[PDB]
């Protein structure tokens, strides 16, 4: 088995409800298998990544893995590392496509190639955008009615907007109508000062069941808050590499991690990082930055093979954009979704929907 | 004085009071007990029990106990049963770990030692502390109202402590259900009672912290065995204001040293057969007592034979550090022996007969499965 | 794909050469191996070995291994051998610990899965790293001169790594003797060699510190398994400048997390049947590699069946972190199976046949002590 | 079994050969001993000794030992001498600290308990460990050359372990002298020997660090009791690569816990009458053994009666943790009792007679200074 051709595509994913610049990769083998992978950074200020950067890195990564056996995930990973440091966003698309191929060649859905299907549907997270306390509360109520159990709620008010008091009120409001078996995550997107986070913690009423995600912009700030925060803490932006997780363990920094396929760098590091987190007893939300059905396929299969007591929802990226790049049989039903049973990722990709490839390597 | 014959018995102990539930979907319907008798040249007989709490509590199971005894029993034949440290050394030199197997032999030897000396075991392990020992219930997992009713029944029987088993999955209601279980179980509390919320190593740190946040203020509760590993427990310890007791994580003497070095806990669940019998219960008592750690003196589970070891040890434990003795008679319907230790005057009192104070019903044990000598 | 039948074999493994000596007066003369075959509905057979190193290396013994398998083997009947994590979970739900017993079943499932995928295990576990894996010698306890000479035999045979056993009692000469044993074993070293001083969890901290004081300056040595407990090892670590590798104290994935949290060591001795098979070896390799811990890839002891698992795993390990593979064929006289992986040009190379690459001598194992299923 | 009568005796023990100097200008010329006998209703008599090493070793003196016995002795009358923990509790409830006074009563109760059971004390405290117990040679403060010569004398007699006293004032030569003493004492080193540099809580951290810097590399030495306080010892520990043994600072069981929590030491000097008798010696041995701390088993000083307690405890102590017993008979010319435990080839073995194995010369003790009596 040999990689023979790699096609790099660029396509715009309009926001459901600006747009996202997606890079979609196909990899072909000498036996005639095709694997697919997606990497689409969430704008250019979520982490140190942007779409133009993803494509510029692929100029180096794609030619380097030509002729390799797509099943040898660690050696392909090493080849990518030896070619270009970091740029895990670019690694992700290639890595995912190789795993798609590998699972196809083994006659397995990806969830069965990555440990085995855990029984039942994966709980899907509801996303609650930044707004007034009462508005966020109503959105939570709307999502509750649709069967969603887990909610990611956005916080991060400037002083002018009302600061820590506003964020505290947003949290209390979102939890006000809660029913048994629900789970809430306040995501600050690395945006609070330690002073803001401490004031916010003081302002919260007692007896709330809430997890705090990505409170601060840097490691040192997050470590200072950690010393004076009794809430479970989940890290997202700050966890990109496997070494990041080791540092977090060393510093006893968090109780959970936000694992995003294209942030961590594809199936290969998602699996390494899941093994580390699981061993550490860290809960894991399994998501991606943003993407089409292709991104969703990687998320779902990985979520499906994650131990349920550690899993804290999967993200359904199809809810984020209007894009229709592929079919996959995994309907959102009752706040949950199930990985399909077709070999590989289970995608039927609409090649024409992607536009002519911006770049081709091989022949 | 010389050990001449060792007999290994196997029997089943049926659960008393309905399916017993622990965290992570573990269920127990009966318990597979291993009962050992040891004979001396002088014609004394000593008894010991080791009954793992199924195969899913710690790294031990009844088949493993018996497999370990195949090496341990022949190893100690010919030894003086009064020389507890040297017999222990012999067992260690023969087979690492397997404290479940050491336990039954170790207890039988102490039974012999005490009989030879004409003393009850409590008066061979430091001396009787005045008054009865308070007894503790084992409240298996169920709904908050089901668990609260079990607490009430034990209250009416004269029990003063209650070990309440928590550890709900997200699907079942998670930390909120566990917090509800705790509040319900404490709701009818009378003066001079004591409660352990035992998660049996079943919570993530995230679940524990959420659970802690949900608990109403002003509760008198001790948290037991919150997490599956040493590193998780340390992480929770850094952010938990409640007193913490460790159980599954404390098996060896070196375990207790690590706990002290890490300042990991304020008490220890000492279970006769988890620690490995009288000899290590005494060593671990000395360590815990010096560190000021409270001690719940229990076993995994067992018959009256297990109960005699538990009771005599609790009876010689300083009362200010003792946090109840487990009365296993409430956990199974088995009647493997008589012991004159009824629940009265506030709990149970060790008998004054030499040894463990047991009258073993051999007809309840079945024919031995293996004999050595 | 379904597991249909599991056979438990018990076979004796006679020692190769002379009496083997570890610290604390531990001597060894022969090995009690348990060998497991797993069959599928499709007619594939996978093989796995678990052979505790006597009964005092870790909390494991062959009788215990077999007793545990009485619970484990029937629990995995009917399962898909390819779903390693779900099979792992089933085993954990059945019996806590007893990774020795998990190991034989887990390895046989990986053997099957790699066969079904048409790949040698090294290519199913990340992919073959180029070139042979260097092999480590196992230098048992003796006088310094005898040890030095045993290092020579192995050197001439193409060995670059040496595990040297230390741990003298005070009567025997204590830390001075151990220091002499170390200096003597390194005395004839040629470029590219690597030395581990393995105490097998047998030194007091006082003994270790005394020994460290007695060693001459300028040695290239790694200290393995100095002390019997976590707390003792932590105390030594605070006052030891040598790289430390943990062996007996690392059995679970959570053990490795605790070592990281405590910044306790710079390497780990990963033994297939100690960690519990291919599945935990892969988990623990991912954790060790992320922390930049070096790894010696070994087993307790075993036949060619143990060796197959060791070798394929070592072959997919990044070479800069790898610190040799144990060749178990040097330790036993058993001929339980054929494998095409001889010592040549730098070490041993995993064969390219799908699976473990074993051809099992089925009459050499004896009639199964127990069978489950069909 | 009931305690019926307690007799308190006082007797002088004349120094034998070499008047001791401890750090800080401390001097000692004879030792004021307190000896207690306890009688039972069944006609058994047990014996116990407590003799503080002068009045400046730890917070104890002979006059204080006797003043405390005025409270402790009547408190334990009518008690069952076999219930060691409950007698201990009664003593603790009666008077805090004063473990020197507890020791004499406690040892006598264990003597009775052992005789009642018809076992030597080593067999009542876990069981006799095979072979003689090594006995420590004591090397008093002197010139490096004189100390070296005395080590050579003890070496020729068969002693293997040496306790060597250090702690020179600046005027006397400071850290340089202490380092020279240490270097000299180890210069004629033969295999299987052990060395303990005892500063008797006498060094400043500055002095200790200077002494450590001055020592040549490659020495096999253990440092005992370097500093006067817990906080000083902690500071030294942070910057000292040698194994550390605490003596004066470890008196209670809670002290050992504090040492574990602070990771302060690798060994402990257990002295029967410092720790408070057989009962606390056993508790502290259990703690230390679990922590892997080495233990030197000694007493402050004493007659054969003190030696009986030392020897029996050392005899039941695991040999890999044991670092010699002190033969107190070498420290005085007093003949207070006969015990069949001759010193031969640098070792001694506990006798087999029930109890401590003493044959006490009542005439050598004088009339009791106090009888209880209540
Ligand atoms: Mg996030
Ligand atoms: Mg001293």
């Amino acid at each position: 088995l040999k990689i023979t051709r790699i096609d790099i595509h660029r396509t715009d994913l309009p926001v459901r409800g600006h747009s996202y610049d997606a890079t979609i990769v196909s990899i072909e083998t000498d036996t005639g298998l095709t694997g697919w992978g997606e990497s689409t950074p969430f704008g250019s200020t979520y982490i140190a990544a942007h779409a133009g950067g993803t494509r510029a890195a692929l100029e180096l990564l794609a030619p380097a893995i030509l002729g390799m056996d797509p099943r040898q995930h660690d050696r392909i990973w090493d080849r990518m590392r030896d070619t270009l440091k970091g740029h895990r966003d670019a690694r992700a698309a290639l890595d995912i496509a190789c795993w798609d191929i590998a699972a196809q060649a083994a006659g397995l859905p990806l969830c069965d190639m990555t440990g085995g299907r855990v029984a039942g549907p994966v709980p899907v997270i509801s996303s609650i955008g930044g707004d007034t306390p009462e508005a966020m509360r109503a959105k939570v109520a709307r999502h509750r009615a649709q069967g969603f159990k887990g909610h990611s709620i956005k916080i991060g008010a400037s002083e002018a907007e009302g600061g820590p008091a506003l964020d505290a009120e947003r949290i209390t409001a979102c939890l006000a109508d809660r029913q048994p078996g629900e789970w809430y995550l306040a995501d600050a997107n690395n945006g609070l000062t330690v002073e803001h986070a401490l004031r916010m913690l003081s302002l919260l009423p007692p007896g709330l069941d809430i997890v705090l995600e990505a409170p601060c912009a840097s490691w040192a700030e997050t470590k200072s808050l950690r010393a004076r925060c009794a809430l479970p803490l989940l890290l997202d932006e700050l966890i990109q590499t496997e070494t990041d997780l080791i540092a977090a363990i060393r510093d006893d920094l968090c109780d959970g991690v936000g694992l995003k396929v294209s942030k961590q760098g594809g199936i290969t590091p998602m699996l390494r990082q899941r093994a580390i987190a699981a061993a550490a007893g860290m809960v894991m939300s399994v998501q991606d930055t943003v993407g089409s059905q292709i991104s969703f396929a990687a998320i779902l299969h990985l979520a499906q093979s994650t131990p349920r007591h550690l899993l804290r929802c999967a993200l359904d990226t199809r809810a984020m954009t209007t894009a229709e790049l592929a079919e996959i049989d995994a309907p959102l039903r009752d706040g949950g979704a199930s990985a399909p049973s077709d070999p590989g990722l289970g995608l039927r990709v609409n090649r024409d929907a992607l536009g002519t490839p911006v770049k081709t390597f091989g022949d």
Side-chain angles (χ1 to χ4, degrees), chain A:
Chain A
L1 200 56
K2 215 178 279 280
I3 289 169
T4 54
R5 182 172 159 156
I6 305 172
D7 284 340
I8 313 305
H9 311 256
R10 173 179 198 193
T11 186
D12 186 76
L13 321 175
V15 175
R16 186 176 290 281
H18 333 273
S19 69
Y20 309 102
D21 188 346
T23 304
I24 287 91
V25 168
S26 62
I27 296 178
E28 294 170 54
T29 70
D30 59 330
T31 61
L33 299 172
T34 311
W36 290 94
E38 172 171 7
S39 181
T40 143
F42 188 86
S44 54
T45 56
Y46 170 60
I47 56 174
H50 67 117
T54 310
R55 286 180 295 263
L58 284 165
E59 289 293 312
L60 299 190
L61 294 185
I65 68 156
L66 285 177
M68 300 187 78
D69 182 335
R71 302 165 293 182
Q72 295 192 198
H73 53 258
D74 289 349
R75 309 290 75 84
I76 293 157
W77 186 258
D78 291 346
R79 172 71 57 83
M80 292 191 302
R81 281 183 80 262
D82 291 345
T83 302
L84 173 69
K85 201 170 237 85
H87 303 76
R88 287 179 169 237
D89 57 310
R91 291 189 195 161
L94 294 167
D95 184 79
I96 297 151
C98 287
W99 275 92
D100 186 16
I101 288 159
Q104 283 174 64
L108 291 164
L110 185 65
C111 63
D112 290 339
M113 272 260 302
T114 57
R117 182 185 300 276
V118 172
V122 169
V124 158
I125 201 149
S126 125
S127 310
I128 314 297
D131 209 329
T132 81
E134 299 297 282
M136 289 176 126
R137 177 177 173 170
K139 204 176 224 177
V140 162
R142 268 175 264 130
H143 288 6
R144 176 180 289 109
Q146 297 177 142
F148 292 92
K149 248 105 169 211
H151 306 268
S152 180
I153 66 174
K154 298 301 192 186
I155 51 165
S158 74
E159 287 300 307
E161 297 164 345
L166 178 57
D167 290 316
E169 286 173 8
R170 285 170 164 165
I171 289 162
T172 66
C174 287
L175 307 206
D177 309 309
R178 75 184 300 163
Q179 300 294 295
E182 289 169 2
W183 185 77
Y184 296 84
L185 187 62
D187 193 349
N189 285 105
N190 265 211
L192 317 179
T193 58
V194 176
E195 186 251 35
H196 177 130
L198 292 179
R199 292 158 63 204
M200 184 189 70
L201 268 25
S202 178
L203 282 158
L204 292 168
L208 293 184
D209 170 3
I210 185 67
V211 178
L212 175 61
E213 174 182 358
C216 302
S218 74
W219 204 269
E221 286 168 288
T222 304
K223 203 193 289 186
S224 316
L225 181 57
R226 175 62 151 183
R228 272 158 298 274
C229 180
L231 275 50
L233 201 57
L234 190 144
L235 299 187
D236 189 7
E237 284 89 328
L238 296 178
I239 309 288
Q240 297 181 47
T241 69
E242 294 79 61
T243 60
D244 290 341
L245 229 29
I246 298 311
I249 291 160
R250 183 78 56 75
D251 278 336
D252 186 23
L253 193 52
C254 62
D255 315 294
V257 56
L259 297 176
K260 282 174 179 56
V261 183
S262 75
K263 167 156 69 60
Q264 322 319 127
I267 306 307
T268 302
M270 280 292 289
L271 291 176
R272 298 174 181 194
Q273 294 176 29
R274 184 170 82 180
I276 297 165
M282 296 175 172
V283 297
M284 285 167 259
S285 196
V286 175
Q287 305 187 9
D288 199 2
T289 45
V290 60
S292 74
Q293 296 77 20
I294 298 163
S295 167
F296 179 58
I299 296 165
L300 184 52
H301 278 290
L302 287 169
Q304 196 71 66
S305 58
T306 303
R308 203 53 61 74
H309 67 109
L310 297 177
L311 183 68
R312 290 300 180 268
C313 303
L315 176 67
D316 188 354
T317 49
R318 307 173 292 185
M320 298 182 68
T321 89
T322 303
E324 279 292 299
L325 303 186
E327 289 180 2
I328 184 172
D329 195 351
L332 185 53
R333 210 204 336 281
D334 241 75
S338 286
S341 67
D342 306 78
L345 284 169
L347 294 158
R348 301 184 291 293
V349 178
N350 186 355
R351 206 179 230 101
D352 289 345
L354 302 171
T356 173
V358 294
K359 193 56 183 276
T360 298
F361 298 93
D363 34 35

